Amino acid sequence: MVKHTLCPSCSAGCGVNIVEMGGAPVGTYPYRRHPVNEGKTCRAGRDCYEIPLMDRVTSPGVKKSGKLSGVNWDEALDKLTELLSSEDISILTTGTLTNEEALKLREIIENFNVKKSGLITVFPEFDYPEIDIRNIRDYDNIAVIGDAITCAPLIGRRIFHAMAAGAEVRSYDRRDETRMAVNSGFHITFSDEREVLNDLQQLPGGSLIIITPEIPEIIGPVLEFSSENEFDVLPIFEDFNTRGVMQHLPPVNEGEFDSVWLIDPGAAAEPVDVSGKFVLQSIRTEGLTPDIFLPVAAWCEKSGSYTSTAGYTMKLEPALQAPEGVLSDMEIFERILRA
Amino acid sequence: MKYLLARATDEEIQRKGECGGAVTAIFKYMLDKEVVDAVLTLERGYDVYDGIPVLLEDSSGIESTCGSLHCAPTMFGDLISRYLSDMRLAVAVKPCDAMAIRELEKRHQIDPDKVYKIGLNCGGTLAPVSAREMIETFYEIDPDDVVSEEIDRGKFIVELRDGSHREISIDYLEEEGFGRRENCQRCEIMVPRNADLACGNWGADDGWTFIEVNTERGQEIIEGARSSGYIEAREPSEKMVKIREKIENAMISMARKFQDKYLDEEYPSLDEWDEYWKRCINCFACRDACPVCFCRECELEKDYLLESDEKAPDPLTFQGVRLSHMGFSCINCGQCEDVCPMDIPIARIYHRIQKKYRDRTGFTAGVSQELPPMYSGEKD
Amino acid sequence: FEPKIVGFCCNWCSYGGADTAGTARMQYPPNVRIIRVMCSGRVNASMILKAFSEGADGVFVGGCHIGDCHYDSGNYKWKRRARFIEDILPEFGIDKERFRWEWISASEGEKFQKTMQEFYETVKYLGPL
Amino acid sequence: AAARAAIPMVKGEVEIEPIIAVTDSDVCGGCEVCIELCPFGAISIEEGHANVNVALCKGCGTCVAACPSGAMDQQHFKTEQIMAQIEAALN
Ligand code: SF4
Ligand code: SF4
Ligand code: SF4
Ligand code: SF4
Ligand code: SF4
Ligand code: SF4
Ligand code: SF4
Ligand code: FES
């Protein structure tokens, strides 16, 4: 009935309980024991229980003339394997796989000798420190780039704890009324990148830099400056396991996608331009029609590990039962390798 | 039969039971002899700090749910009203659970004929992570290696795996910002007389549960469990009844003193309240957690009230509206404050308002069977 | 400083009282804005709180005398609500003198005039909210 | 008085004002905190939802003001209308 699980809505590692009645998810319950949020959730955390039921597609779909028609799993895994071996396939994944599934995806990427692949994320490959968010209050100086409270409310909670602890918090964004702008010790509405960087020159060594993805072009320079001068960088990634997937799969830095295979079990992928073919492996087609569709289990219907932005890793047993006809991404990968 | 001392005729249920296992034996009888369809209780997770609601449709392995959990400040009223309002149920309720269930029954969200309330005496609960940190800091032990908790002596007592007991003044822990939740310190009701039965260990011997029978439904429960040979029961001393009465009175006096402390003399100022309200992210966790806020559609989400920008809402059109809607029925369960992502002390203001209303009109939320005088149809 | 005042008046007596004051041409300050309801029982705390949140510096409610309600029991329910609202308002920095509720009969134009004048003086003295 | 009383009886019909309470069944939770507030007993409960009798309702609006969730609403005195008037009075 009541089962522990992770909130998939953002990259904070908040724990929730799913209340299941007769095999279906019916509600949410506070997961007070979880250390990231201690049973506190934003609205999305309390709404996450509806995801496994909303517009769920649970049967493989191969695009017949014009539209998508049902098909058995073997007839899709074939017509996918041939596509891998023959055509120029680029594999793109969101930060919604389990860590083990990401390792398997790396194995596949090597086996089929794909040249372009990786994780969809605006952040680069960095030596991010493993920061405990409960330690955010310890930092004397915290620089916040982007609206961190809105991006991850339960990390903004720790920023508030830090403010109450005496830390001086400086916020930077292109807007001057965001939640961080309102609640920061000092806010700057910069229009030129150096504007923020100069102020970052005033930080002491060992200061915290909480950076969101709202300002993409600043991530590179800020990480370069933080690599120098010894700052601890805390990113706010896009997906609930962007960090875990990035551990194995590099961020995709190509822009010539055709015949792409999108692996988005969490349905978090933004509309991606596909010049050629479009294989979609998700829990709900919605969006546009894909050439092939492989329904998968939801984040809470799997067994596996997820890593939050801070670096907290959580091992999960399924909170629900996967609907008939859907396979975990691990099963798809293993069968594709076997074929 | 206003008073009894009871214990499970079984031996495993007695062993793993907190105080002779009368509650578990009663639930076992209720399921086996088909008084109800199911039992809603608690079960510990992967440690004593993780409590999870469980719905047992049969008594096999019921013993896994015995024992108290002071680090499990759970609420069952909204669970029953949202999911189990159709089935014949028996539930274990702390006084706040019974108060929420009574506020919901008078609003026809729960059928009183369907729900049997085996209430438990309650001296307060603690938050799990906070309890772990307190034990780490002030007991000089790992939060792990602890297997029980208790607040009998006025001391918070943890029972280490080996068998040792470590007790520290709950007054001293509370003075340091730890111990029971603030709403529990203000709580005025320790004996759930708004339940069919009230079970505790105040007037009870070791290995026995003191049970006060509040209603004839409770009397039927007790006599059915005793005739069916699930619980053995006898009469209290009537020297122990006075000890229990004195304990209840002393706890009530302490609750009144803490009410004065938190609601008047350490109450946040208007500037401090402004600083708090500036934080609110409009997540509605407080309303969702509140058992009295049961409505299918909430007025706080209407266009003319809902704050549509990504900024702190005006506390008037959110907090004052919710206060006008239900603050006369606020049971001081502290669920709103527990779940707030922004760490706002909401239960303080709601309890203070309810106290004003109760002082004026004499309505006590969760205890009176009738609706608040606000809803009276008479010319009174 | 010119305070902003919002008024709620029942159709049968208090609105009638304001009409009586008008017909007799009893002058009073123009700050109040009257909104008509059938009964003072139609008024609830959400309206008062919305008024104060939208910029009102005072809120007046007028009803039939107890025992004179056209719908025979509505003003009782309003009276209960009004006491609770007086409880709630000071918790958010709104003095309970900014929230006035009175029983005005349809023929009590002079009482309505005096209430309006005095409430205006009170709210103006309190200053902007 | 005879003439004045004869006029309506000759007409044979009178109009009832439709300013009455209406319940949204999809929103009403059957809490019933509205029934006792009607001095004329116009509100009953059918199928777990509040139901208003037009013949008994007089249109005071007390029940509508009492309903927290807003399932009950008075015709011609809806909550949105009064809220719009309050907003316009100050803006
Ligand atoms: S902060 Fe992020 S992880 Fe936590 S409840 Fe909100 S959306 Fe979910
Ligand atoms: S509020 Fe009262 S009944 Fe509820 S847990 Fe606290 S002390 Fe016990
Ligand atoms: S307002 Fe808070 S303390 Fe009062 S009943 Fe609701 S959840 Fe409990
Ligand atoms: S705030 Fe009012 S409408 Fe919303 S749930 Fe609570 S009582 Fe119902
Ligand atoms: S739980 Fe806290 S942050 Fe969320 S709406 Fe309530 S008061 Fe605001
Ligand atoms: S008060 Fe509202 S929700 Fe309750 S029964 Fe009446 S119309 Fe339905
Ligand atoms: S508007 Fe008045 S008369 Fe009509 S149902 Fe509601 S309380 Fe009764
Ligand atoms: S009609 Fe004026 S108060 Fe009821």
Side-chain angles (χ1 to χ4, degrees), chain B residues 126-151 153-184:
Chain B
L126 310 84
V129 168
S130 282
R132 281 168 64 73
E133 196 221 80
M134 180 200 73
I135 279 166
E136 205 182 8
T137 309
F138 300 103
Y139 281 81
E140 308 278 283
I141 53 170
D142 202 20
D144 290 345
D145 309 343
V146 163
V147 296
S148 186
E149 283 94 347
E150 212 257 11
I151 317 201
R153 290 162 169 163
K155 296 254 181 121
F156 175 76
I157 322 176
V158 314
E159 185 275 276
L160 295 132
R161 284 201 190 292
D162 42 22
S164 294
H165 277 267
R166 284 296 325 111
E167 34 164 274
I168 299 179
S169 198
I170 195 74
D171 289 345
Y172 170 50
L173 301 159
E174 276 152 17
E175 189 69 355
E176 213 67 281
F178 294 97
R180 302 174 293 157
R181 312 178 288 150
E182 314 287 34
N183 78 287
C184 282

Side-chain angles (χ1 to χ4, degrees), chain A residues 271-272 274-284 287:
Chain A
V272 305
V274 183
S275 305
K277 276 210 176 354
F278 177 32
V279 185
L280 176 68
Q281 178 169 335
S282 184
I283 60 171
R284 79 173 160 279

Side-chain angles (χ1 to χ4, degrees), chain C residues 21-65:
Chain C
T23 298
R25 276 154 192 81
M26 294 157 176
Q27 310 298 291
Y28 57 81
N31 299 64
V32 64
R33 272 90 180 106
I34 289 155
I35 293 160
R36 188 166 70 112
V37 286
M38 298 313 304
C39 182
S40 78
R42 181 68 190 83
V43 185
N44 64 5
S46 283
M47 296 156 196
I48 315 306
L49 290 158
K50 173 77 159 163
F52 276 126
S53 172
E54 286 310 281
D57 306 288
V59 179
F60 170 81
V61 180
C64 306
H65 283 270

Side-chain angles (χ1 to χ4, degrees), chain A residues 237-253 255 257-269 271-272 274-279:
Chain A
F237 293 131
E238 303 91 322
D239 309 312
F240 64 96
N241 194 37
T242 305
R243 192 126 165 182
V245 176
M246 200 171 41
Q247 153 168 213
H248 307 283
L249 300 172
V252 68
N253 61 336
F257 297 150
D258 81 3
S259 200
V260 58
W261 176 13
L262 182 59
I263 293 161
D264 174 18
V272 305
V274 183
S275 305
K277 276 210 176 354
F278 177 32
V279 185

Side-chain angles (χ1 to χ4, degrees), chain B residues 280-286 318-319 336 339-342 344 346:
Chain B
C280 176
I281 53 148
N282 208 46
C283 73
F284 290 95
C286 43
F318 186 110
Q319 307 288 342
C336 48
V339 304
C340 183
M342 270 327 114
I344 299 163
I346 310 156

Side-chain angles (χ1 to χ4, degrees), chain C residues 9-15 37-42 62-65 68-76 78 103-104, chain D residues 60 62:
Chain C
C9 285
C10 84
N11 173 77
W12 296 103
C13 277
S14 195
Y15 200 98
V37 286
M38 298 313 304
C39 182
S40 78
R42 181 68 190 83
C64 306
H65 283 270
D68 277 56
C69 169
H70 189 82
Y71 308 93
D72 156 73
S73 46
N75 48 359
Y76 294 94
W78 162 242
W103 307 127
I104 312 286
Chain D
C60 73
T62 302

Side-chain angles (χ1 to χ4, degrees), chain A residues 5-63 66 68-86 89-253 255 257-269 271-272 274-284 287 289-318:
Chain A
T5 191
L6 169 81
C7 172
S9 295
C10 83
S11 48
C14 298
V16 304
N17 284 320
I18 289 169
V19 172
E20 164 257 303
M21 281 271 293
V26 299
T28 278
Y29 206 71
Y31 188 173
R32 276 183 182 86
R33 178 61 171 70
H34 202 277
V36 160
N37 59 318
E38 330 196 29
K40 305 162 178 287
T41 44
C42 74
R43 201 81 184 277
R46 266 162 287 116
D47 290 3
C48 78
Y49 78 91
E50 302 158 340
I51 288 159
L53 295 164
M54 205 209 64
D55 309 351
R56 192 87 176 269
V57 175
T58 83
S59 64
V62 202
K63 186 174 181 179
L68 190 91
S69 93
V71 156
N72 81 79
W73 268 106
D74 285 80
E75 201 213 61
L77 258 61
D78 314 304
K79 198 193 157 135
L80 179 60
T81 298
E82 66 87 19
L83 198 34
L84 318 192
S85 296
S86 66
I89 50 137
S90 298
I91 315 187
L92 308 186
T93 170
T94 58
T96 59
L97 294 163
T98 67
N99 302 334
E100 304 84 15
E101 276 158 11
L103 186 68
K104 221 77 198 167
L105 195 51
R106 172 201 191 61
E107 174 173 347
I108 283 183
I109 276 159
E110 172 62 325
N111 260 36
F112 281 102
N113 322 279
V114 172
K115 339 290 209 189
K116 336 192 291 199
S117 70
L119 156 62
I120 299 160
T121 187
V122 297
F123 287 85
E125 187 96 34
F126 200 71
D127 201 318
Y128 300 104
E130 279 162 1
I131 299 147
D132 193 346
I133 58 157
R134 291 129 101 201
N135 293 335
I136 285 168
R137 44 161 199 191
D138 290 340
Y139 289 94
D140 307 324
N141 284 86
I142 309 177
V144 170
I145 286 141
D147 187 356
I149 293 158
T150 312
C151 286
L154 268 300
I155 289 161
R157 153 175 202 256
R158 306 294 186 171
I159 291 167
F160 274 111
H161 284 180
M163 269 158 194
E168 91 182 61
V169 171
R170 311 187 70 78
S171 55
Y172 315 80
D173 206 322
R174 321 308 274 293
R175 295 154 298 144
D176 199 331
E177 82 281 38
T178 62
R179 290 199 161 88
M180 272 300 322
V182 169
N183 288 280
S184 46
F186 195 81
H187 176 75
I188 286 161
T189 302
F190 70 89
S191 209
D192 161 59
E193 100 170 347
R194 193 57 227 171
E195 186 144 16
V196 51
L197 271 151
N198 278 120
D199 184 1
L200 284 165
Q201 204 96 42
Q202 273 68 266
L203 286 170
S207 289
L208 186 66
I209 287 184
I210 302 166
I211 176 156
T212 83
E214 302 218 282
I215 302 123
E217 76 276 14
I218 205 53
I219 300 159
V222 164
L223 300 185
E224 193 205 43
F225 197 114
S226 300
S227 296
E228 290 260 313
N229 313 104
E230 171 38 69
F231 295 150
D232 292 5
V233 182
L234 177 59
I236 316 296
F237 293 131
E238 303 91 322
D239 309 312
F240 64 96
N241 194 37
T242 305
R243 192 126 165 182
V245 176
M246 200 171 41
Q247 153 168 213
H248 307 283
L249 300 172
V252 68
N253 61 336
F257 297 150
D258 81 3
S259 200
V260 58
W261 176 13
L262 182 59
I263 293 161
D264 174 18
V272 305
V274 183
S275 305
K277 276 210 176 354
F278 177 32
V279 185
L280 176 68
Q281 178 169 335
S282 184
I283 60 171
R284 79 173 160 279
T289 301
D291 296 349
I292 326 189
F293 185 87
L294 298 324
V296 285
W299 91 98
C300 53
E301 306 171 318
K302 296 170 152 184
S303 180
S305 303
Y306 298 114
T307 295
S308 82
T309 40
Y312 179 82
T313 302
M314 191 207 177
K315 180 59 163 60
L316 285 170
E317 296 317 313

